[PDB]
Amino acid sequence: ARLTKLVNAAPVMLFMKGSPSEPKCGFSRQLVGILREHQVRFGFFDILRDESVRQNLKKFSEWPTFPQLYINGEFQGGLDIIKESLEEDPDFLQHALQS
């Protein structure tokens, strides 16, 4: 419930290390970069803030690492999967927001 409300805090929600302006990992920084470059406006949460949320989100999404991107409450991938998704569909981020 805690996690559902968090992953749905914004239509696009990025779970990352650090914040978008002060990232604390290279993959966090690159995935921020990709969202900005597509003019995507997004919420975020710094999973460094709380081990419980950090570990439980991995259980939640069934994905072992961060960052983790959610769109409309659905898990979309980490960096490498978002990049592959964009290779397939340059308009991936658009398409994933559609209802």
Q: Known binder of ligand: residue 25? A: yes
Q: How many CA atoms lie within 13 A of 7 on its CB side?
A: 20
Alpha-carbon distances, residue 87 vs 71, 83, 92 (angstroms):
18, 6, 9
Count of the separate structural domains present in the chain: 1
Q: Give the contacts of 1 (CB within 8 A, at least 6 positions apart).
A: none
Q: Convert the chain into a string of H (helix), E (strand) and C (coil).
A: CHHHHHHCCCCEEEEECECCCCECCHHHHHHHHHHHHCCCCCEEEEHHHCHHHHHHHHHHHCCCCCCEEEECCEEEECHHHHHHHHHHCCCHHHHHHCC
Structural domain containing residue 48: 2-99
Which domain CATH number covers 94? 3.40.30.10
